[PDB]
Amino acid sequence: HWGYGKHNGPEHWHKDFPIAKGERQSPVDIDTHTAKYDPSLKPLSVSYDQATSLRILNNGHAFNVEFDDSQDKAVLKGGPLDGTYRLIQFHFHWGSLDGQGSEHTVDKKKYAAELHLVHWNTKYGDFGKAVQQPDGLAVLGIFLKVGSAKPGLQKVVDVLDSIKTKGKSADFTNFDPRGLLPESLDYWTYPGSLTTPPLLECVTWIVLKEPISVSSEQVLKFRKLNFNGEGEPEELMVDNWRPAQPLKNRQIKASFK
Numbered sequence: 230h231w232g233y234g235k236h237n238g239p240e241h242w243h244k245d246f247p248i249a250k251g252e253r254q255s256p257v258d259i260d261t262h263t264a265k266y267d268p269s270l271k272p273l274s275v276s277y278d279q280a281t282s283l284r285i286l287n288n289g290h291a292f293n294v295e296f297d298d299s300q301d302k303a304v305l306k307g308g309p310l311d312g313t314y315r316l317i318q319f320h321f322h323w324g325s326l327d328g329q330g331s332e333h334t335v336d337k338k339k340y341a342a343e344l345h346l347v348h349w350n351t352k353y354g355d356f357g358k359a360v361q362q363p364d365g366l367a368v369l370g371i372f373l374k375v376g377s378a379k380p381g382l383q384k385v386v387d388v389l390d391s392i393k394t395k396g397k398s399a400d401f402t403n404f405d406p407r408g409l410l411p412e413s414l415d416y417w418t419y420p421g422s423l424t425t426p427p428l429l430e431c432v433t434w435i436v437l438k439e440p441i442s443v444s445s446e447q448v449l450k451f452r453k454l455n456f457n458g459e460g461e462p463e464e465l466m467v468d469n470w471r472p473a474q475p476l477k478n479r480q481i482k483a484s485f486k
């Protein structure tokens with residue numbers, strides 16, 4: 230099974246998932262001086278007021294907070310998006326050290342972690358159908374830097390103990406995702422893909438310019454999770470990120486200048 234170890238990491242993925250060497254793979258390095266400011270880009274419209282979190286689960290490679298996507302409860306629209314995208318789940322990618330962890334980089338700079346808010350285009354009926362379309366998903370990427378503690382992240386941090394190993398889950402209702410958003414919504418956008426296998430190229434990436442701050446203690450608890458299942462030898466869940474991929478025939482557009 231794919232992973233992040235020396236023997237099953239990103240460099241091995243192409244063998245089981247040929248698309249790893251595709252034309253629009255993610256993440257990518259964002260060159261701020263080459264990004265094109267596009268005045269036609271509309272502002273982002275994030276409507277998370279009716280968000281309904283359900284559960285938090287350790288899936289062996291990260292922990293996902295799942296949301297009820299049966300109706301337009303938490304949606305994303307505007308920006309470079311055409312149509313409404315529903316929030317289905319959010320996860321993080323982090324490193325073993327504060328100087329690494331993010332998947333996307335800015336001018337080669339790596340952040341301590343990266344939050345991914347995954348959304349699927351509603352015109353496609355369900356997530357399964359969305360992952361078969363070039364415009365099926367929209368992931369909102371947010372960088373995390375170590376500094377002051379993020380209050381809205383604490384409830385997520387406190388529940389990590391119960392989902393220490395792969396396969397474990399815990400009820401996680403009434404969590405407001407808006408507490409994880411930065412002040413500004415300025416972003417960079419480009420067509421890409423999932424950063425983990427199957428690496429499907431169905432994503433319109435929206436990476437926010439402004440990072441959020443989290444405390445050393447908060448990030449530390451992320452590192453206490455396990456890749457392994459209960460009863461198996463312990464493997465600390467750290468460095469679950471993929472290196473930058475070639476931009477190729479793509480242009481990153483900025484909503485700001």
Ligand SMILES: NCCCCNC(=O)c1ccc(S(N)(=O)=O)cc1
Pocket residue numbers: 345346347360368422423424425426427
């Ligand atoms: N068949 C589709 C795959 C099912 C499970 N994987 C996902 O849904 C998924 C979603 C977002 C990212 S990421 N990291 O790019 O936000 C990575 C993976």
Ligand SMILES: [Hg+2]
Pocket residue numbers: 359360361362363364365429430431432
């Ligand atoms: Hg696709």
Ligand SMILES: [Zn+2]
Pocket residue numbers: 320321322345424
């Ligand atoms: Zn991700």
